[PDB]
Design a protein around this nucleic acid. Structure first.
Ligand SMILES: [Mg+2]
Ligand SMILES: [Mg+2]
Ligand SMILES: [Mg+2]
Ligand SMILES: [Mg+2]
Ligand SMILES: [Mg+2]
Ligand SMILES: [Mg+2]
Ligand SMILES: [Mg+2]
Ligand SMILES: [Mg+2]
Ligand SMILES: [Mg+2]
Ligand SMILES: [Mg+2]
Ligand SMILES: [Mg+2]
Ligand SMILES: [Mg+2]
Ligand SMILES: [Mg+2]
Ligand SMILES: [Mg+2]
Ligand SMILES: [Mg+2]
Ligand SMILES: [Mg+2]
Ligand SMILES: [Mg+2]
Ligand SMILES: [Mg+2]
Ligand SMILES: [Mg+2]
Ligand SMILES: [Mg+2]
Ligand SMILES: [Mg+2]
Ligand SMILES: [Mg+2]
Ligand SMILES: [Mg+2]
Ligand SMILES: [Mg+2]
Ligand SMILES: [Mg+2]
Ligand SMILES: [Mg+2]
Ligand SMILES: [Mg+2]
Ligand SMILES: [Mg+2]
Ligand SMILES: [Mg+2]
Ligand SMILES: [Mg+2]
Ligand SMILES: [Mg+2]
Ligand SMILES: [Mg+2]
Ligand SMILES: [Mg+2]
Ligand SMILES: [Mg+2]
Ligand SMILES: [Mg+2]
Ligand SMILES: [Mg+2]
Ligand SMILES: [Mg+2]
Ligand SMILES: [Mg+2]
Ligand SMILES: [Mg+2]
Ligand SMILES: [Mg+2]
Ligand SMILES: [Mg+2]
Ligand SMILES: [Mg+2]
Ligand SMILES: [Mg+2]
Ligand SMILES: [Mg+2]
Ligand SMILES: [Mg+2]
Ligand SMILES: [Mg+2]
Ligand SMILES: [Mg+2]
Ligand SMILES: [Mg+2]
Ligand SMILES: [Mg+2]
Ligand SMILES: [Mg+2]
Ligand SMILES: [Mg+2]
Ligand SMILES: [Mg+2]
Ligand SMILES: [Mg+2]
Ligand SMILES: [Mg+2]
Ligand SMILES: [Mg+2]
Ligand SMILES: [Mg+2]
Ligand SMILES: [Mg+2]
Ligand SMILES: [Mg+2]
Ligand SMILES: [Mg+2]
Ligand SMILES: [Mg+2]
Ligand SMILES: [Mg+2]
Ligand SMILES: [Mg+2]
Ligand SMILES: [Mg+2]
Ligand SMILES: [Mg+2]
Ligand SMILES: [Mg+2]
Ligand SMILES: [Mg+2]
Ligand SMILES: [Mg+2]
Ligand SMILES: [Mg+2]
Ligand SMILES: [Mg+2]
Ligand SMILES: [Mg+2]
Ligand SMILES: [Mg+2]
Ligand SMILES: [Mg+2]
Ligand SMILES: [Mg+2]
Ligand SMILES: [Mg+2]
Ligand SMILES: [Mg+2]
Ligand SMILES: [Mg+2]
Ligand SMILES: [Mg+2]
Ligand SMILES: [Mg+2]
Ligand SMILES: [Mg+2]
Ligand SMILES: [Mg+2]
Ligand SMILES: [Mg+2]
Ligand SMILES: [Mg+2]
Ligand SMILES: [Mg+2]
Ligand SMILES: [Mg+2]
Lengths: 54, 114, 119, 209, 123
RNA sequence: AGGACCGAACCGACUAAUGUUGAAAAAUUAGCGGAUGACUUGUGGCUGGGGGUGAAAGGCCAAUCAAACCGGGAGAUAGCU
RNA sequence: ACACAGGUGGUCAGGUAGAGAAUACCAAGGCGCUUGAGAGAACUCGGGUGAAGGAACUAGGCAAAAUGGUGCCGUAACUUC
RNA sequence: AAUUCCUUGUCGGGUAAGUUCCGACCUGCACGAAUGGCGUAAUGAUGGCCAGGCUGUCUCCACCCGAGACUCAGUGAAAU
RNA sequence: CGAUGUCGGCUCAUCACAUCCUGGGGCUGAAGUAGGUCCCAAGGGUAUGGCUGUUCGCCAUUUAAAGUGGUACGCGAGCUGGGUUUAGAACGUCGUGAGACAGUUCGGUCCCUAUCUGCCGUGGGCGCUGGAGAACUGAGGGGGGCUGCUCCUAGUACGAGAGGACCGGAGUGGACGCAUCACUGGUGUUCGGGUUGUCAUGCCAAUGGCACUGCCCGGUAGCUAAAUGCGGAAGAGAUAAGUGCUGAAAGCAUCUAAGCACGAAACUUGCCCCGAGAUGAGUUCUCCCUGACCCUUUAAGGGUCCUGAAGGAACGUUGAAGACGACGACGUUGAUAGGCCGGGUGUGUAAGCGCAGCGAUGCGUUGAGCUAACCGGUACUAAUGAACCGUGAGGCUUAACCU
């Protein structure tokens, strides 16, 4: 099963339109550390909801 | 459920005896031959028991006229009136399905003395 | 199909999944905190918390069963000595899952699973 | 006729003195309250909408809260609608009960079935399967052919193949009612109703009987 | 659940012991035969001197089934073998004068009153 | 003792399935036959193209054989595309 | 042609079972075979089980399923014995 | 008949039913005696038929265990 | 012919009517059942086996009936390779011979990850003229439409008799589909137990690993069929063949030219489902922000500050929802998931101890121990305070009303 006519750049772009990326809606800030981390995840130092775990 | 467990108790029978698998059991079953009702006796070994509450059942196997017959009875069904134990046996299982490929002097169960 | 079922294959057979979970539970008991993928950290709770409730009642049969499950005397001894009285007041909840982020080699989610009474 | 909305709880059996174990699917039909009555003058038809159950005050939205407050009804878990016939009238604040089916013998039950996901042709349309041996290769459960060669040379619309099977609204008619418990708000219907336990079902009087 | 090519024992004393079912009566695409369902069989193993011989084709009824019958209350009555009773192609009446083994109450009818009476036990 | 038997190494490839822009330009798994003899294998040598060899299939002769490969006649000829 | 599921001659031969270099588990010793994680649709491949019938499927018992070892009684037609 | 177009030649056996199988009839299109004929103990990864057991081959499929297929991160072709 | 792959078989169907059954009717040398012929009618259904590679065909037994043909003698980028049709070999025949035989016999590689149309299903964007959350009207489209047997009517009508009714009701079943797991069973390599070989835990005991889940015995939930509930309609409108009423052209007659009525599983509704992108973009109950500034291009204009609502989106716990999307429930004002308590179910008297027996082993503690997906509860843990998107009263013309 192979193609019979060469597709176009328009069709290629239409197909790739749904292949885009979605960025992060917003970031979270720790109450005491003031950093920026992902939602429900820990920071790069070991802070989560103000407490220290590392 | 909290409603199923209440709807399945208004029909459950409280006069059910305790019988283990592999014991000689007597069952009286209602039979309606036309317009009159009578009782029929079914005596045999219990090779399987399935406890599910109202949906509980037990199997009885017996040799009749040279042919083996197995029959499942619903424990809490009004068609069954009396269940009695004539001889209690000792087995190390709960499903005696090896009594179907075996008959005669090899299919004798011991007696449980308690 | 998968309806009302439980358990996760994790692209492994039973003989591999049981051994991996046993090793992970032993490491978690030994170190009080480990880092692993989120599904593994979630499935390890169902193996470790019953193992802690078993140690909550000290006896010979319980220790024998724990040894059968873990194959680590140095782990079962600690589980029955320290974790037992430590979690004797908690009605479950012997683990705490904290998301770590992702990974470089496969970009899989990562998380730290530890004991609630660690620090 | 005016139907009601209930919640499926499970299947069980009921014994009769004759020695019959009738299957039954218990349906819990709580006090079904009225939310709005639609007349022929404004909406163009005679109907009535019904609310069942209760919902969180922190979860019910403001438009729903206002719509319920217009009638004077607590926030339920959904809204259904039933058409009306001649001689049938209601108000906005009524709360119908399960006693409406006291003199009803056969009912129709409508509900969403259980989703089986993306199912194969054999499971979806009761197709047959080719031989698993004698030389077969990679075509043990395939549907096979779909059309004819270059006449028409396409695929007819409505062909039976793989796809979604379940999660759809199905109606089973002429189910016999066994018992009505007004105190416990329970309806006993013989047979099997579509949908798993906890689903919402619509029970109506039989349209044909 | 009796179908074609099924091997059955014989309950009556017409001179047959092993029979093979070839058709099931009742309609089109009829594949399963329970108790009281008329089928057609051929004779594969027969006694030397009996009312029938080997190779005969005739109707029969099912009195025992390993699959078993199902009572309305759910009580299923099974057996340990599949046995049948011979009949006549025209009159559909039994040939032998005895019925070995027990039978089931789901068989009694105006057409089979001569089987339950001869059976030593009825379930 | 046996061109004896069952059955491993070893040799071979009868059936099925996978694969067939394959892990592989003939393989993999489950089975299979011979397996002390007309057996198999290592090393070395010899037999060559109208010729060699061939328990003989038009089979093999360096993944190519109803006449091997390289160079030359040669830009053979082509009423053919 | 590849860090290729292929081919390549000789030697050493451990333990428990076991007739044995077959097979299972192991010691000395060597490896997890250079992309992983996640959910657990149709469908493909390697498999396991199965209510009653048991070749009715099919060109065809193809495939699949089934016995399968030691000791002992005993074993037909036919025969170049 | 490994040979017979007419042919599914006729009879018998097996099957409830047998253009396949076996034993006979000979009307051998077009067997035949060392480009050998008849039979034949043992043997065949040989051709055909029947039987016992055996089973998802099927009646009619159902569930489960793993590898792919599905999503994410990286590398990244092809026939046309 | 710089390739359109071929007979038969399996799965998959679709259309047609010169119809096999069901439906209605006319004639009959149609007394009745059962029949023969013809007209209308395609809504539904239309068999299993032995032989052969075979379609076809013969036979056995059913069926209400076992239709005729087209679709590249339908369908090999769906399957099969039995035959036909390559290279091997043989028989019969011909040819002195290499060889030939739609004469026969044994064996003999069927590749393709779908680019476009099509189809089965699931989504993102935008629009429907302020936005958002819900319930619907239903233009239109799709699914189904089959029938046997027994009894009553009635051994009545009919017939000198065997024989045996039309119409109309009741009941039970076969094939088909939808739904479900309460019951009957399968699976259940996540539960329990028996047992063989071997290794290991310092050793006995007790366990773990491997040998298809090592081989097995039962089995929770879930999924299932062989299991159990349901459906095929009743009825209405307009009709074909057909039967008619009144009634002239044609003083009669005449179903028709005016007019009226009956009439089939054919058609539209009626039963179920999808469904306003039905751009002709629909209807209804609700909710939401009623702040100021300047600039040329004077307008459906551009920009600034403040404001960020209803609601939605995102992350997380997740689901009897699901390929990814999507949908549903919950998120500290909470039972959403995990864990825990109790119960239930399943497996089947756990380990240890003591006693009896030289011993294997049995007995009491003990229906004990264990118990996945089940139920009723429990915040013990994880679902965070936030942030983001989405705005700030909604164009022109005309008709009615109020100013
Ligand atoms: Mg082209
Ligand atoms: Mg894309
Ligand atoms: Mg769950
Ligand atoms: Mg993977
Ligand atoms: Mg294993
Ligand atoms: Mg689902
Ligand atoms: Mg089939
Ligand atoms: Mg092949
Ligand atoms: Mg295959
Ligand atoms: Mg192939
Ligand atoms: Mg094609
Ligand atoms: Mg030899
Ligand atoms: Mg060779
Ligand atoms: Mg070969
Ligand atoms: Mg091999
Ligand atoms: Mg071999
Ligand atoms: Mg040998
Ligand atoms: Mg050499
Ligand atoms: Mg040469
Ligand atoms: Mg030369
Ligand atoms: Mg040749
Ligand atoms: Mg070569
Ligand atoms: Mg060659
Ligand atoms: Mg030459
Ligand atoms: Mg020259
Ligand atoms: Mg040239
Ligand atoms: Mg490599
Ligand atoms: Mg290599
Ligand atoms: Mg050794
Ligand atoms: Mg799978
Ligand atoms: Mg198997
Ligand atoms: Mg087995
Ligand atoms: Mg089976
Ligand atoms: Mg079993
Ligand atoms: Mg069986
Ligand atoms: Mg058999
Ligand atoms: Mg056959
Ligand atoms: Mg056939
Ligand atoms: Mg075989
Ligand atoms: Mg001869
Ligand atoms: Mg011939
Ligand atoms: Mg003959
Ligand atoms: Mg002959
Ligand atoms: Mg001659
Ligand atoms: Mg000759
Ligand atoms: Mg001659
Ligand atoms: Mg001579
Ligand atoms: Mg000669
Ligand atoms: Mg010769
Ligand atoms: Mg056989
Ligand atoms: Mg992918
Ligand atoms: Mg390229
Ligand atoms: Mg051509
Ligand atoms: Mg071309
Ligand atoms: Mg060709
Ligand atoms: Mg016609
Ligand atoms: Mg039509
Ligand atoms: Mg119609
Ligand atoms: Mg046969
Ligand atoms: Mg064709
Ligand atoms: Mg073809
Ligand atoms: Mg094509
Ligand atoms: Mg061939
Ligand atoms: Mg030819
Ligand atoms: Mg000729
Ligand atoms: Mg494909
Ligand atoms: Mg959309
Ligand atoms: Mg069930
Ligand atoms: Mg249950
Ligand atoms: Mg079971
Ligand atoms: Mg099992
Ligand atoms: Mg089950
Ligand atoms: Mg062991
Ligand atoms: Mg020991
Ligand atoms: Mg090991
Ligand atoms: Mg007149
Ligand atoms: Mg007139
Ligand atoms: Mg009808
Ligand atoms: Mg219990
Ligand atoms: Mg004991
Ligand atoms: Mg134990
Ligand atoms: Mg004990
Ligand atoms: Mg006791
Ligand atoms: Mg418990």
């Amino acid at each position: 099963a192979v193609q019979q006519n060469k597709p176009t750049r328009s069709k290629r772009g239409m197909r790739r339109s749904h292949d885009a990326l979605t960025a992060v809606t917003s970031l979270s800030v720790d109450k005491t550390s003031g950093e920026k981390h992902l939602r429900h995840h820990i920071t790069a130092d070991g802070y989560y909801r103000g407490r220290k775990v590392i | 459920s909290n409603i199923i467990k209440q709807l399945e108790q208004e029909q459950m029978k409280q006069d059910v005896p305790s019988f283990r698998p592999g014991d000689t059991v007597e069952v009286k079953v209602w039979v309606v031959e036309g317009s009159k009702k009578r009782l029929q006796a079914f005596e045999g070994v219990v090779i399987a028991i399935r406890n599910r509450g109202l949906h509980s059942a037990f199997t009885v196997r017996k040799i009749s006229n040279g042919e083996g017959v197995e029959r499942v009875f619903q424990t809490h069904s009004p068609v069954v009136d009396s269940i009695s134990v004539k001889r209690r046996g000792a087995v190390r299982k709960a499903k005696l399905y090896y009594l179907r490929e075996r008959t005669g002097k090899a299919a004798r169960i011991k007696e449980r003395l308690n | 199909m998968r309806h009302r079922k439980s358990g996760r294959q994790l692209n492994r057979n039973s003989s591999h999944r049981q051994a991996m979970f046993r090793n992970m539970a032993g490491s978690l008991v030994r170190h009080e905190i480990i880092k692993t993928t989120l599904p593994k950290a979630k499935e390890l709770r169902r193996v470790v918390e019953p193992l802690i409730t078993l140690a909550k009642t000290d006896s010979v049969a319980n220790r024998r069963l724990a040894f059968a499950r873990t194959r680590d005397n140095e782990i079962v001894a600690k589980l029955f000595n320290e974790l037992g009285p430590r979690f004797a007041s908690r009605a479950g909840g012997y683990t705490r899952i904290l998301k770590c982020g992702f990974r470089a080699g496969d970009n899989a989610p990562m998380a730290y699973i530890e004991l609630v009474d660690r620090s | 006729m005016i139907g009601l909305v209930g919640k499926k709880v499970g299947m069980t059996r009921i014994f009769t003195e004759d020695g019959v174990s009738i299957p039954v699917t218990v349906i819990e039909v709580e006090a079904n309250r009225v939310t709005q009555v639609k007349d022929l003058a404004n909406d163009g038809y005679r109907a009535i909408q019904v609310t069942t159950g209760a919902k969180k005050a922190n979860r019910v939205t403001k438009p729903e809260a206002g719509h319920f407050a217009k009638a004077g009804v607590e926030a339920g878990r959904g809204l259904w609608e039933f058409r009306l016939a001649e001689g049938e009238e209601f108000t906005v604040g009524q709360s119908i009960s399960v006693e409406l089916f006291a003199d009803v013998k056969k009912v129709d039950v409508t509900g969403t079935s259980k989703g089986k996901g993306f199912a194969g042709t054999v499971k979806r349309w009761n197709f047959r399967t080719q031989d698993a041996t004698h030389g077969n290769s990679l075509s043990h459960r395939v549907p096979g052919s779909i059309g004819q060669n270059q006449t028409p040379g396409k695929v007819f619309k409505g062909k039976k193949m793989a796809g979604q099977m379940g999660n759809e609204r199905v109606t089973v008619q002429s189910l016999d009612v066994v018992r009505v418990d007004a105190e416990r708000n329970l309806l006993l219907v013989k047979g099997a109703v579509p949908g798993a336990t906890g689903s919402d079902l619509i029970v109506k009087p039989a349209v044909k009987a | 659940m009796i179908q074609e090519q099924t091997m059955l024992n014989v309950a009556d004393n017409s001179g047959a012991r092993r029979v093979m079912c070839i058709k099931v009566l009742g309609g089109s695409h009829r594949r399963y035969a329970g108790v009281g369902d008329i089928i057609k069989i051929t004779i594969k193993e027969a006694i030397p001197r009996g009312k029938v011989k080997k190779g005969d084709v005739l109707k029969a009824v099912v009195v025992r089934t390993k699959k078993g019958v199902r009572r309305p209350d759910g009580s299923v009555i099974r057996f340990d073998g599949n046995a049948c009773v011979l009949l006549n192609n025209n009159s559909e009446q039994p040939i032998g004068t005895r019925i070995f083994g027990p039978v089931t109450r789901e068989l009694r009818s105006e057409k089979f009153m001569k089987i339950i009476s001869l059976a030593p036990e009825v379930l």
